[PDB]
Amino acid sequence: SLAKRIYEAYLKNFNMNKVKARVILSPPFVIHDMETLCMAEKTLVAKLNKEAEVRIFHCCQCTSVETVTELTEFAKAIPGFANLDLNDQVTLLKYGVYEAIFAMLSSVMNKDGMLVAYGNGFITREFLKSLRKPFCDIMEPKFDFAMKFNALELDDSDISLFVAAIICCGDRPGLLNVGHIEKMQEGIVHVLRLHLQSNHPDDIFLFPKLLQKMADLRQLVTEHAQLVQIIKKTESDAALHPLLQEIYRDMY
Amino acid sequence: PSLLKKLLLA
């Protein structure tokens, strides 16, 4: 029942999921060079004169701001989360959202590129590599993570529980009631363990594999925040959205 | 307060 409630909250609150992404990825407009990036912008984000890399940077920020709002509503729907001290809810979301974001982005990624703009575009991995430093260094580690993550062949029922476990993490810095959160996480992880054994009877190590992926995600996010800081202090026109500034502020 | 706090409050 806890598993079902978490899965239903995931289906309700996230506009994109692995089934919807797989349906599309089998017709999105392909962004693979400067010309098609410009055409996609005219069609899909008509509002925006700046460098191509900074324009993509601002589209990326806007995407992340939307996903944080989806994750906040998802978290509120996790049984017990709303019983926590509000300050601890903030702390859980602050440290959890980007691990959740990069885990879920894997659902829209393949070896050649990734869905963007609510499924209406597909940006190639090579085009992103072709951008000027430091922007060409941002997505490649995320593609590397996603290739291995997708090899586990999780479905949306698995991922919903994985994301809940990421959010409900008792060892975030600055938590007031560490004990309540640890207890809440123990129940989620218990339901995830049982779910993996029923849904993936062929992979007896899937649960410890996924525990390792949450540690990999923590390190991926730490390194990503270092790129955020390199951009914020060197890039002339790369203004941070205030919500994302709040999230990155004093996080590692 | 904070933008996250606002988000958590409906």
Ligand SMILES: CCC(CC)c1nn(-c2ccc(F)cc2)c2nc(CCOCc3nc(-c4ccccc4)oc3C)cc(C(=O)O)c12
């Ligand atoms: C390092 C600085 C931060 C901004 C605070 C950043 N920088 N970058 C980043 C920038 C430029 C690039 F070249 C590649 C990546 C980012 N990327 C993503 C994934 C967003 O993934 C969905 C996505 N949507 C698009 C897109 C493209 C065109 C039109 C519409 C959407 O592209 C992608 C990758 C998230 C973040 C994030 O910290 O929040 C982020």
